Every structure is written in structure tokens, then in C-alpha cells.
Subunit: 132 residues, 2 copies
């Protein structure tokens, strides 16, 4: 198989439709004999009393669970690659583009039913939309 | 390879970016051992003197040339499938969705840089965007 689809990126957030997108990205990765790289985006207020560190630990912990499940799915299907935890500074769309650049992804897979509209309007890299 | 990507549809109009999308759809079709179905969309005034039949013959003829080239690319790459000429009544986006339903396509491939925004906003079927 060529390199145009050698490395596939799929954005996860724990939602059902994102999980649905993962199953689609996996199936594509297995069919095209490609590497899959699931990413969980941690997208984190400045106020008296408020402590953002509580939610940072939370979504990171949630990311661990989500990415571990993604890894488990990949292992069973025999699909190579390793899930990444990504954190925005940025907006989610750009962070996904930065992740794609640094990982070397030639394709971004997303679950849909705005960030998708962003990535499409950007047109910086091939994007695959999977509806719920 | 599974059936989730057994039949791929790619929308052509003769433009460079659509041709670029065809090369991407072909590469995917070859990697996933999938059938490719390129479609050329004929999207056709009511005025005294004006004769739409002239342009109908034209874009159909242009479609023949475009689809013949697509077939030639598929044949060389050893990719199965057969190009289709489609005509709107409808809008282009819905016509592509109707074509996907009748052909049995599980994926629609498009070249981008509105119809893409439509198909995404519709979310009736998986869509792959390839930027120029």
C-alpha cells in the first residue's frame, strides 16, 4: 500500500459518534494496511476559587481510558500505531492540524452529526467525515 | 477487505482539484482493493432564443471525455468499477447522495479548496475531502 494513507489520524473525545468514527478508521486502517493514530484532545476558567487543575487531571484521566480502549481495539484488529494525548494551548481544529503535521498523518478521520467545518474550511489536509 | 469501503464514489467535473481527488480515490481504491465509481455531474435557462440543448450535449460530451480518462486511469491501476454520468433534475449535493444510494456507495470522495459543505452538513453518508 502507498504512503498517501500510510498514517491515519482519528479524533476521539469519548462520544458515541467519535467511537463510531474510530471503528471506521480502524476498518480503513486494516483494509489499507495502514498505521492508526487515535488522538484525544484535552481542551481546557480564570476566577476566584476556581481550580482548573481539577478538570485537567480529569480529562487527562478520561483520555487515558479512552486511548487505552482505542489501543485495545487496534491490538485485536492487528492494526499498528499508538494513540496520543493532545492538549490545546489554539483551537481544537488547529491542534488536530498541528498533531497531524508532527505525527506525519496524511489523513484525519472525524465523527460528525463546527470543528469538522473548520478543518474542511481550512483544507490543510485530507479529512474523512463519518456521520453517526 | 471489508464492505465498509467496498464501493467508492468520487465526484468529477473536469477541474484540476477534482482530478487530484480522483488520484486520491484511486490510490485508496487500490490500497483497500475497492471498486471505484467516478461520477460526472451534469448540472443544467428559460429565455427567448436561448437553447439549453446546446449546453446539454456539450457537458454530456465533456462528461464522456472526463469519464473515459477516469476509466483509463482505473484500468492502468487495475481498479475495478465503472464511471457514471449523472444529471441533476435537485441540487448537485443531493444528486450525489442519490447516486450513492442507487450505486451502493459507502463513501463519497470530493475535491475541495459549498457542495462539500452541503454533503457534510447533510451527513447522510461518509465523505472524504481532498484539498487542492
Amino acid at each position: 500500500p502507498g504512503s498517501m494513507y500510510s498514517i491515519i489520524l482519528v479524533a476521539l473525545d469519548g462520544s458515541q459518534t467519535a467511537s463510531h468514527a474510530l471503528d471506521a478508521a480502524l476498518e480503513l486502517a486494516a483494509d489499507a494496511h495502514a498505521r492508526l493514530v487515535p488522538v484525544y484532545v484535552v481542551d481546557m476558567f480564570d476566577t476566584p476559587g476556581y481550580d482548573p487543575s481539577i478538570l485537567v487531571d480529569a480529562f487527562r484521566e478520561e483520555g487515558r481510558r479512552v486511548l487505552d480502549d482505542a489501543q485495545a481495539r487496534m491490538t485485536r484488529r492487528g492494526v499498528a500505531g499508538a494513540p496520543r494525548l493532545v492538549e490545546v494551548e489554539e483551537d481544537v481544529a488547529e491542534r488536530l492540524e498541528r498533531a497531524a503535521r508532527e505525527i506525519g498523518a496524511s489523513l484525519i478521520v472525524m465523527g460528525t452529526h463546527s470543528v469538522a467545518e473548520r478543518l474542511l474550511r481550512h483544507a490543510r489536509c485530507p479529512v474523512l467525515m463519518i456521520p453517526a
